[PDB]
Structure formats: C-alpha cells, structure tokens
Amino acid sequence: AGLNTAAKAKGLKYFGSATDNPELTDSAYVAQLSNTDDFGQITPGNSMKWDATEPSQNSFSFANGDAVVNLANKNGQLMRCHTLVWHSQLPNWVSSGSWTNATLLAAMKNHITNVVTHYKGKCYAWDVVNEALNEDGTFRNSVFYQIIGPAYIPIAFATAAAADPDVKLYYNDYNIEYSGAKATAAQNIVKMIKAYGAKIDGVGLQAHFIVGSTPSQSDLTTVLKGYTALGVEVAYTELDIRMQLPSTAAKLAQQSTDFQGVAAACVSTTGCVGVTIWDWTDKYSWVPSVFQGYGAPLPWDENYVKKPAYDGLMAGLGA
Numbered sequence: 001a002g003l004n005t006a007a008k009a010k011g012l013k014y015f016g017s018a019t020d021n022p023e024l025t026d027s028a029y030v031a032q033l034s035n036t037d038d039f040g041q042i043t044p045g046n047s048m049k050w051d052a053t054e055p056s057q058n059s060f061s062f063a064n065g066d067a068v069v070n071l072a073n074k075n076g077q078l079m080r081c082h083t084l085v086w087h088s089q090l091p092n093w094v095s096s097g098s099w100t101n102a103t104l105l106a107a108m109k110n111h112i113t114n115v116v117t118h119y120k121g122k123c124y125a126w127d128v129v130n131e132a133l134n135e136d137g138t139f140r141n142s143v144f145y146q147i148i149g150p151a152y153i154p155i156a157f158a159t160a161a162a163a164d165p166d167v168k169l170y171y172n173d174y175n176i177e178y179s180g181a182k183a184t185a186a187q188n189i190v191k192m193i194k195a196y197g198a199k200i201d202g203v204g205l206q207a208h209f210i211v212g213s214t215p216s217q218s219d220l221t222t223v224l225k226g227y228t229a230l231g232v233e234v235a236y237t238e239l240d241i242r243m244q245l246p247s248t249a250a251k252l253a254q255q256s257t258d259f260q261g262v263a264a265a266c267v268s269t270t271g272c273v274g275v276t277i278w279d280w281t282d283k284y285s286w287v288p289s290v291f292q293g294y295g296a297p298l299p300w301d302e303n304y305v306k307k308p309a310y311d312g313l314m315a316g317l318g319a
C-alpha cells in the first residue's frame with residue numbers, strides 16, 4: 001500500500017520522513033505525514049539540535065522536540081533522534097566560549113547526557129555526531145575538534161551509550177554514500193570509536209543527492225556494504241534529490257530513476273534498516289533556501305501530489 005509497507009515487506013525496519021514543528025499546524029500535511037502506509041518513522045528536522053535543546057548552558061528545553069515525538073507516538077511511528085554533537089545550529093554560548101578541553105568536554109558530555117536521558121526509550125537511533133569530516137577525509141575543524149581533538153567523537157558515543165544503552169548510536173554525514181576519501185574516513189570513524197572502546201551501532205548516510213548526478217546503485221551498494229562489513233547497520237537518513245530548476249517532465253523522470261537506485265541499494269544490502277526522506281513534500285524542502293536555483297527534491301510536489309519519484313521509490317523497493 002505505500003513506501004513503509006513496501007520497505008517492511010523487504011525486511012527494512014521502516015520508510016520514514018523528517019518534519020519540523022511549524023508544519024504540524026497544516027492539517028493536510030499532517031494527515032499524510034501520519035499515513036503509516038507511507039511513513040513508519042519520523043525525524044525532527046530541527047527541534048532536537050543543540051540550539052533548540054540547550055539554549056543556555058545547563059538550561060534545557062524539550063517542548064519542541066517532545067511535540068514531534070508525541071506525533072510519532074500518536075501514529076505508532078518510530079523516531080530517529082537528531083543530533084547531539086554538530087558544528088552547526090550551536091547556541092552562542094558554545095561558539096563564543098573560551099574553552100579548555102576540560103570545560104568544553106564537561107559541557108558536551110552534559111549536553112549529551114541530559115538530551116539522551118530525556119529521550120531514553122523514545123528513539124530507535126541517535127545521530128550522535130554529525131558531519132565530523134571534511135571532503136578530503138580530514139576532521140572538520142569545529143570547536144569540538146579544535147579544543148578536544150579526535151577523541152571528542154568516541155567520548156560523545158560513550159556518553160550517549162551510558163545514558164541510554166539500548167538506542168542505536170549512529171555517525172551521520174553527507175558525501176559518504178559514494179566511494180572516495182570521505183566514505184573511507186567515515187569507515188575509519190567507525191574503527192576509531194571501537195578502538196577507544198566506545199559503542200557505535202550505525203552509519204547514517206544523509207543522501208542529499210542531485211538529479212542526474214546521483215550515485216549509481218552499484219556504487220551506493222558497495223559503499224553500504226563497506227560499512228556493514230564493519231559490524232554496524234546503515235540507513236539513508238536525509239534522502240532528497242534536488243533538481244536544477246525549472247522542473248520538466250524529463251527531469252522528473254530522471255529523478256524517479258535516481259530515487260529508485262537508492263531504495264534498491266538499501267534492499268540489496270542486508271543491514272540497511274531503512275530510508276528517511278528529508279521531508280516528503282517540495283513545499284517544505286530545505287533545498288531552495290540553501291542551494292540557489294535547485295529545488296523540487298522530494299516524492300510529492302508542493303501541493304501534496306505524488307511525483308514520478310514516488311513510483312521510482314516503490315519500484316526500487318520491489319513493490
């Protein structure tokens with residue numbers, strides 16, 4: 001009957017979607033987000049990030065994150081929880097701080113423990129560290145890397161695992177879905193976390209792709225299997241396939257095949273537990289405001305009508 005039923009028929013745990021709190025007032029939107037034929041899983045796009053959950057040091061704020069969890073709960077949908085440690089969407093107090101390793105570590109760990117404990121039992125997975133890599137596979141020079149060094153990564157994982165030993169702990173990034181230095185470096189992150197003795201369960205592959213320039217199914221699959229070989233699971237976490245505007249029939253058809261290969265790569269890899277799209281309607285995509293001249297990235301259009309990419313996903317899921 002839909003993306004989520006099809007995914008689960010093939011052994012995935014879910015097909016899901018991100019959302020954000022302003023969208024939850026739109027009844028037609030909510031009705032489709034709440035359609036469990038299509039979505040068995042939800043990710044909050046913004047309300048579990050650091051700025052949203054710890055706007056001042058030791059002063060936590062969960063209303064907006066909780067409202068997304070309550071909608072998934074109402075629907076019987078799983079949650080992915082996103083994201084504990086990331087260089088973006090930090091509150092001023094983190095980015096402007098005069099830190100030592102000891103004082104930043106205490107603040108980071110306190111952030112993790114409080115947010116993960118708050119959501120204990122409520123998340124299928126956490127994206128514990130997000131976007132820690134440069135494109136060449138070096139570490140991104142965030143505040144956390146500059147002050148703490150590489151250890152911030154395993155320390156973050158270990159702190160999350162202490163707070164909630166059951167939730168799947170993921171490393172999440174973009175441009176780690178195709179073969180190259182960045183994906184190799186993401187494998188090396190998995191290895192490093194375990195060499196520290198810390199827990200990592202999954203690799204999250206954002207999958208912000210471009211129509212006509214999407215990784216092939218074969219390379220996607222090689223990359224997925226390069227992570228599952230390490231003894232972790234994998235998921236596509238933020239799938240969207242942005243097109244160079246204007247939209248045309250031919251671009252919409254290409255977009256379909258591009259989405260199809262992503263779904264099919266996940267099915268083909270035992271250990272790929274699911275796909276989440278970064279919202280589901282073009283109306284609410286983050287893409288146009290960030291990638292100038294691109295848009296129409298999702299399987300429904302801006303009036304909530306299915307595009308050819310819906311069918312491409314269904315075909316890649318073998319439905």
Ligand SMILES: O[C@@H]1[C@@H](O)[C@H](O[C@@H]2CO[C@H](O)[C@H](O)[C@H]2O)OC[C@H]1O
Nearest residue numbers: 088131174175206207208209210290
């Ligand atoms: O802020 C980051 C964006 O930079 C990231 O942009 C990448 C750039 O490389 C490719 O173009 C990839 O397709 C895009 O998504 O996307 C995640 C976001 O948080």
Ligand SMILES: *[C@@H]1O[C@H](CO)[C@@H](O)[C@H](O)[C@H]1NC(C)=O
Nearest residue numbers: 101102105146147148149151
């Ligand atoms: C910060 O402290 C931890 C020990 O808590 C350590 O693993 C790491 O090397 C330190 N980093 C730096 C840059 O001093």
